[PDB]
UniProtKB/Swiss-Prot annotation, chain A:
The keyword ATP-binding does not apply. This is Proteasome subunit alpha type-4. GO terms for biological process: proteasomal ubiquitin-independent protein catabolic process; proteasome-mediated ubiquitin-dependent protein catabolic process. PANTHER family: PROTEASOME SUBUNIT ALPHA/BETA. The gene is PRE6. Present with 16800 molecules/cell in log phase SD medium. It comes from Saccharomyces cerevisiae (strain ATCC 204508 / S288c) (Baker's yeast). It is found in: Cytoplasm; Nucleus. It holds the Pfam family Proteasome. The keyword Cytoplasm applies. The proteasome degrades poly-ubiquitinated proteins in the cytoplasm and in the nucleus. It is essential for the regulated turnover of proteins and for the removal of misfolded proteins. The proteasome is a multicatalytic proteinase complex that is characterized by its ability to cleave peptides with Arg, Phe, Tyr, Leu, and Glu adjacent to the leaving group at neutral or slightly basic pH. It has an ATP-dependent proteolytic activity. Its main location: cytoplasm.
UniProtKB/Swiss-Prot annotation, chain B:
This is Proteasome maturation factor UMP1. InterPro entries: Ump1 (IPR008012). GO terms for biological process: DNA damage response; proteasome assembly; ubiquitin-dependent protein catabolic process. Residues 1-35 are annotated as: Disordered. Seems to be degraded by the proteasome upon its formation. Residues 8-26 have a biased composition (Polar residues). GO terms for cellular component: cytoplasm; nucleus. Present with 2740 molecules/cell in log phase SD medium. Belongs to the POMP/UMP1 family. The lineage of its organism: Eukaryota, Fungi, Dikarya, Ascomycota, Saccharomycotina. Short-lived chaperone present in the precursor form of the 20S proteasome and absent in the mature complex. Required for the correct assembly and enzymatic activation of the proteasome. Also prevents premature processing of the PRE2 propeptide. Pfam families: UMP1. Keywords: Chaperone.
Swiss-Prot record, chain D:
This is Proteasome subunit alpha type-6. The proteasome degrades poly-ubiquitinated proteins in the cytoplasm and in the nucleus. It is essential for the regulated turnover of proteins and for the removal of misfolded proteins. The proteasome is a multicatalytic proteinase complex that is characterized by its ability to cleave peptides with Arg, Phe, Tyr, Leu, and Glu adjacent to the leaving group at neutral or slightly basic pH. It has an ATP-dependent proteolytic activity. GO terms for cellular component: nucleus; proteasome complex; proteasome core complex, alpha-subunit complex; proteasome storage granule. The keyword Cytoplasm applies. Present with 7210 molecules/cell in log phase SD medium. The 26S proteasome consists of a 20S proteasome core and two 19S regulatory subunits. The 20S proteasome core is composed of 28 subunits that are arranged in four stacked rings, resulting in a barrel-shaped structure. The two end rings are each formed by seven alpha subunits, and the two central rings are each formed by seven beta subunits. The catalytic chamber with the active sites is on the inside of the barrel. Pfam families: Proteasome, Proteasome_A_N. The modification Phosphoserine is found at S14. SMART domains: Proteasome_A_N.
From Swiss-Prot, chain J:
The 26S proteasome consists of a 20S proteasome core and two 19S regulatory subunits. The 20S proteasome core is composed of 28 subunits that are arranged in four stacked rings, resulting in a barrel-shaped structure. The two end rings are each formed by seven alpha subunits, and the two central rings are each formed by seven beta subunits. The catalytic chamber with the active sites is on the inside of the barrel. Interacts with CIC1. Present with 16900 molecules/cell in log phase SD medium. Coiled coil: none annotated. The chain holds residues 37 to 248 of 266 of the full protein. This is Proteasome subunit beta type-7. Signal peptide: none annotated. GO terms for cellular component: cytosol; nucleus; proteasome complex; proteasome core complex, beta-subunit complex; proteasome storage granule. It is found in: Cytoplasm; Nucleus. Belongs to the peptidase T1B family. Its main location: cytoplasm. Keywords: Cytoplasm, Nucleus, Proteasome.
Amino acid sequence: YDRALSIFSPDGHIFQVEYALEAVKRGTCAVGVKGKNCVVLGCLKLQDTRISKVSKIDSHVVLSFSGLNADSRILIEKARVEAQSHRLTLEDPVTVEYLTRYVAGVQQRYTQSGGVRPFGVSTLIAGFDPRDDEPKLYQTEPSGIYSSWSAQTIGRNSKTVREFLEKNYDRKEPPATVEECVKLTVRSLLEVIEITVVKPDSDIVALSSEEINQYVTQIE
Amino acid sequence: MNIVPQDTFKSQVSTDQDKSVLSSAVPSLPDTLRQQEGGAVPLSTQLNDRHPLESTLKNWETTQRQRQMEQYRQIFGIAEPMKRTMEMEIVNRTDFNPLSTNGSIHRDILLNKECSIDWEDVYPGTMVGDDVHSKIEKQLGI
Amino acid sequence: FNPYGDNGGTILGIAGEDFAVLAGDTRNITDYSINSRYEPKVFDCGDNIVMSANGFAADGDALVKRFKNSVKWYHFDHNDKKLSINSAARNIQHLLYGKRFFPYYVHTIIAGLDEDGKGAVYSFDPVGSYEREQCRAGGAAASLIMPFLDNQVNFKNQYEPGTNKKPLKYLSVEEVIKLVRDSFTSATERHIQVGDGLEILIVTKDGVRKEFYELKRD
Amino acid sequence: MFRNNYDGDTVTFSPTGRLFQVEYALEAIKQGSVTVGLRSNTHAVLVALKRNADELSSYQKKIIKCDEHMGLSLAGLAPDARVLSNYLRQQCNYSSLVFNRKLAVERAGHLLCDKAQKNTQSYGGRPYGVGLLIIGYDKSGAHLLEFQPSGNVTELYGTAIGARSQGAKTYLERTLDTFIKIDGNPDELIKAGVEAISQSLRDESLTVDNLSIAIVGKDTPFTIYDGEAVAKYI
Amino acid sequence: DRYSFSLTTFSPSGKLGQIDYALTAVKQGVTSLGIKATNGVVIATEKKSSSPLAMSETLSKVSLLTPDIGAVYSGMGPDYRVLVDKSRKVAHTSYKRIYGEYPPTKLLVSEVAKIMQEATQSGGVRPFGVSLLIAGHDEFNGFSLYQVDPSGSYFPWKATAIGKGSVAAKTFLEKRWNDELELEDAIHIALLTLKESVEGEFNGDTIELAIIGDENPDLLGYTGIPTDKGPRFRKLTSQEINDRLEA
Amino acid sequence: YDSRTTIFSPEGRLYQVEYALESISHAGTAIGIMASDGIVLAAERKVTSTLLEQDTSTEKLYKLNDKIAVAVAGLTADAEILINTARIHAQNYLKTYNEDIPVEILVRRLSDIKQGYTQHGGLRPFGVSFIYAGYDDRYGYQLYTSNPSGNYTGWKAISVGANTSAAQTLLQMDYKDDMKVDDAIELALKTLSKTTDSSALTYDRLEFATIRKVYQKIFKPQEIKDILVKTGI
Amino acid sequence: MQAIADSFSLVKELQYDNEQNLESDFVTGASQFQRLAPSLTVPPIASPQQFLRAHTTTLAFRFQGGIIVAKVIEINPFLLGTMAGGAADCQFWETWLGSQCRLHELREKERISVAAASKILSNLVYQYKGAGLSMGTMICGYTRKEGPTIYYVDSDGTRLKGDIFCVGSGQTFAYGVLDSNYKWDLSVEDALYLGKRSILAAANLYHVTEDGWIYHG
Amino acid sequence: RATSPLLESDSIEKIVEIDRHIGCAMSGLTADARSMIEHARTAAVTHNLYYDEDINVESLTQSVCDLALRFGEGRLMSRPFGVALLIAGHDADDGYQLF
Amino acid sequence: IILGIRVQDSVILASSKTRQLSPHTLMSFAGEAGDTVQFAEYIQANIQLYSIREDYELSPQAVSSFVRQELAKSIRSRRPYQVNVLIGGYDKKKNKPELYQIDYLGTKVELPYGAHLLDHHYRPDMTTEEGLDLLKLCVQELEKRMVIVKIVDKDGIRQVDDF
Amino acid sequence: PIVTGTSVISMKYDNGVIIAADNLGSYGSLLRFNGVERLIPVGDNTVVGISGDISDMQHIERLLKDLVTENAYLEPSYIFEYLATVMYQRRSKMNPLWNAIIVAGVQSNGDQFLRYVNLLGVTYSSPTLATGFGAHMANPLLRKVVDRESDIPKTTVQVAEEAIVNAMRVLYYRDARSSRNFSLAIIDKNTGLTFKKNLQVE
């Protein structure tokens, strides 16, 4: 019952989608943390550094991913095209929920035929709605399911990093400062650095590879 | 049983007539960015004062094919046009190639165009929606 | 080739309290030649709806046949639910505007009762603007039909004698029928197209009734 | 055993010519609930034992109406019953719109036969797996057609389809001599039908909710009696 | 049904099975060979016939693609015939109709290779079970000889042979080839190689040979345009081939 | 699970794409080296014989544009299909913006093309990996590779094909990023000479190119032989 | 195959082969009443536009309390549209717009931006630009984020925003009398007074609020 | 149901509005539920637009099931939906009813 | 009305509208209502999509080539709508201003100034203060014959209240 | 319209309907083709009379033979409804049949049937119908025999026939496109369909 998207398992599972989630489980780890005022995302010798896994889809909304890199790049390109198409047809920038809904729809669409492979990628979408300051963080899955999270981790070590976040996050005492979110993110990563901070009104900073937080957390 | 293509004008028009290029935000209007036609400015209303030949030259071959199938139905019965069409659809549906513009080598044999050139052969004639994935989605109907 | 013609004849919707009247002449015209003296210009559509698409006869027949079929589908889908007069009007609006660039060259009127049982008349532009109306004339002699009725059912520009407005009155269904009769008699007297006969559909809470009255044959 | 190899599609015959995949769709009727139909010369009657999924649920609508002259009864797959009923009613309508003639019941049945046959021979679809009883009244009088999803149509005086239809059909076979003469007294034909459907019952009895009736005839457009209207006949 | 799965696929070894099996079908085909001279190219092959009642004059294994370009094959003759038809059509449509001149051999070979490759991606067709030796002349590239394989790979060769005799023919060519051959020397070496490769009766009617050489104005069919160029492709008659064999 | 490229295995891995990757392990090694003042490209001509026209077998190094070249490893037919698609893309870009295409945009387009063939079931992956050398005025000299999977990476020096692990180890030991093009040529030749399965790195077994100064040169076998003897091979 | 065969197997003459015709005449169900973006018939000729050709004052301004507007189609309880141009075209396309808005609000679970609604309108009108659709709907509303918002939309597809719009026969008199008094910091009943004075100078009131539009007679 | 305490329960949305008097609760493969709810909403709004009348809840659930048919003959979908819908509403025809 | 002046330091544009195509690139346009603004906003969405995809500003020359190509492609299908476009941008790579005009047929030309007089005034060496004075003079002569003002600069795009 | 048919005239009578046509196709002013029969019986109970373009006439005549051939697997009303639908859909296609058609017959209940249809799809009943020039000259004469539907039971077949022959005589006198030869059909509920070919004005 494993060898098509069309086939339900006798127990109601569609194994071919669970195998795409197993494909996600092999991708390099991506972490996301919402604060009160920001969302924080993070994750050979002869590599040419100048030519980050966190991809801006629009000035106000950002997409990270884990899983197959090429699939992720195709889905990022489609998300960017949709963001600009909305911004053209309607005057308003896309809602972050609208963007993640579109991405999950695209991932679902590539699940609706046995002749096409589903995207073996899960995305972490972070940003702020235009003229809004509630931080929003979402996950999408190969099935085209999507969910809103206070913090999440996907890929190779998502189990342990998530079990860490489940105890170091507090749903009613969330980190209330940018440095506190970056601290919690780096700590979660140090369980296994690159950090991006997104702030309201289209303000996004890749955090300069400041090792200060690393040294501080190693002192702790 | 036509020589010149008769049925050559759209009888009905709608903003949604063009499928696969619709706005995801408002599924009633075109996606002018994905159209890449130079904006909305090619509004569908501008399909006016077409060249008199164009509406016949585009679909000349289709009309010749339809006449040929009609002649085969009249003389040989429903079996022969059915066989021809089934063969042709098998060829069309099994040749998928998103990178090549060229016509299938077997399609030309079935059409009996192995030793024929036309201007469509000589003159076979984008930031969005040109990708291989757009062709995959068109072909599978994703 | 011109895809339209004028078949003449006239229609008249009147909304009562508990009734609505739709009247039309039965003569069919082409140019100065009488095509027939009795075509039924007004139709019972069921659901206590009466309809007439006045104007080009063929487009009227097409529109009323599409409407009746749409009513059939409305019944199939909604288990014989009575189509409401407002829903009927919205249906006919969408039927009309679907022709926006090749319109049915007709002015159409439906008469019925609303969910209150109050007399209802609707009239539609050939491109499907519509209004709830208490009375409406249509067709070539509409300008003859309407002002008299606007002077006899309404009392507009009348005053209480010497008290330089007299109040309007509710009218019994037979009294408005008699006013339609007299109005069409005057219009056939003065307008050459107003037919040889007058057929009146009376919508009531009991159902629809058809009445027919002869008019001058010249 | 070897049936397992040659039963995967409607496109493989077995070494014995069986075409099992159609046989399985004909067995799909046996999973349906019983319905009876019968006619006299002037009237035609359908009777159906409805079912409900649970005591908290309403009974499923088993009988339908093509137009004011003909109607239909379902047994078997609900999706295919929906398809065929929509098809039969879109044909009844197109016939009326284009010709302003009531579609002959026999013609409607032949149209169903044709539609059903296609799925028996192409690879991709599947047979409709649903039996239909058609009744109507036209210029030729009262009609009863049984449709089988193999694409077979027979005009009958009476029949039954569904799980235990064999009982009702055996009863009708004993009594056809009586019901065909019941002309101008449709109440007795309805009661004969309810008697016929009183066989083939199991752990159950006919009730105003579970029983549904319809009738059509020379003086009687297609009418459905269900609920309290059935208590006249129980 | 909107999709058909790819018939050609990689094996766990990384080898595309249908490509290997098409190359095996080529190995099974009768020997053909070609040789660049300094002043021409030879292509030759055996006219194996299923009967002596067959008309050898209809076993056109060597075929003109352009007045300057010719092809031969080993393997599935029907595939070769369809490929020849398509290569001629593309030589006209893609090139002669655009630039007013026949394509260079390199670009017609590239077009044939493109056509053959796409049968390796399609899920509707098998690859072609033929390899082609394409010999031609170009005003700038001069005389050239390419071998196109079922994969749609092609390489330029000084001399090559394909089919059953391919390896022994390639060794005989490698020992006998030199950069100074004249076209008559290349024709002699070709005939000796085929005599060594052929099975059974070796005569001018069991062989055919074509050359790319100087223009043949007696094959042009018209006179009086002095810049206009007779075909350089020329098939040898079986009379001439027999007159070679008497050497 | 491996029968078709559209099926995930239970391990979540696409065996058909891993087999397309493994196909390149049998192509002769290609190598690319980016220097302070240019880029070197070199490749082994593993398919070689004395009857082959080495002088005209340009068969692993293809220029896609001015200021951009590719080195090919794997199926040459697929290679030339992708090369002609990329050439058409580069010329469309020049036609639209009147500027030379950035190298990364071309690499991205080609990698998206290669990816799509892994995602529709009637297509197989291209059994070919390119090394891209080029120059643009955004990133200057830059060097990339891409796999049958359609992922790509930027590299200072890279090797693809059969002995990529050995060549990349020799690069990792010997490469230093302040070397000049004339140094990188010799480092490439050393690497290939130590990597090749041949008894000796004869000039006919090599194809060589450089991008520097902006001009690109594909070496004719004479100057290849001269560069070899200058290096001392 | 059989589908192919049945293509070669009386319905051609009345064109009830054509699926969109079967739908239009309600043969193939009620599907004509099941489509958004209603299909419009065009005459099957080389020059449809030739065949087609051959066939009030209102005010708004933004202020502290919202907008006052002074035939105002209730597109939604939060959006108002001044029917202008062809009444049939206005009634139809504003009803369609109201349905598109309802769908947007359902999917996104927010009140549509007045900018978004006006853009949807202008885009659709543009798409039919050059074929009828005489249209001048001024679009008015209030959104928690946007605040009071005004957009005019035209048959020609113009879309324009401003603090004051004066349209119709006395538009220049209304504009002159308003500019003599207009302020941002008007009190609610003061703005109502200035509005009535400016309409009276040009001889309905609608008050537009975060909790919807209000009619003041 | 929540996979983890970091999941925001305020965004699970297992109950949705289809129309002013009709709601729907999901269970199963949420992607298919999204597709059915978008269809139902489109049907409801279209019925309002064309009939000036809110959809009968029975007619709505009929349309929804007509969608679920389209894994076979009315094909659109590779497989049946993995979702059941529980549609509750009020109408002037039959009042409060649950499907 | 639209007007633009290329100065030694800046590009100055003026109009009686405009879209920002990128932080260092500005577009101003005149022509038929709807057609012109639908075009300008399709162009803006395209340049924004490019800038997002590359994380890099498209140069003013490439922007003006794109607008030329898109305008020609727009005309091919339909009657030419009357439009004229001025694109003023600062080329951060060459470190100099550039001004392009595109006519309703997609004829593109690099201009020192254009509109849709100054030969007696305009000097290539002017400063943006001299350019703003020349703009004031030109508007004064325009009002004799019968604005929003933008500057494009190393520091981006600037509004000027000294209209 | 190149070859055109002159005019059809018809009336109903106590037991049936009479229809007549002048059996001539004119090529403009050239009376090119004689013996062009324009009355087309469609089974025992109806005759379709067609006027205008004779080529379109022969296309509608084969549509009618197709109709009969399919029914063999009719009332006058059904043939009319089909014809009218074809006509109107051709109109809306902007591809009219340049014809005016009268479907005359008797319903199986015995009701007389007369409907006119033209290229526009305009339709009407009357006690008397005529097309083209017959609508101006013949109709006045037939309307003197049956002015109203109460006159039908008063009008014998002999008088209706003599009236039709007189109207054909008047048409021959005053219509330049009329022939002297004409065909007449009587559809009677009792005696069935009588189709008198090649009558002459006398």
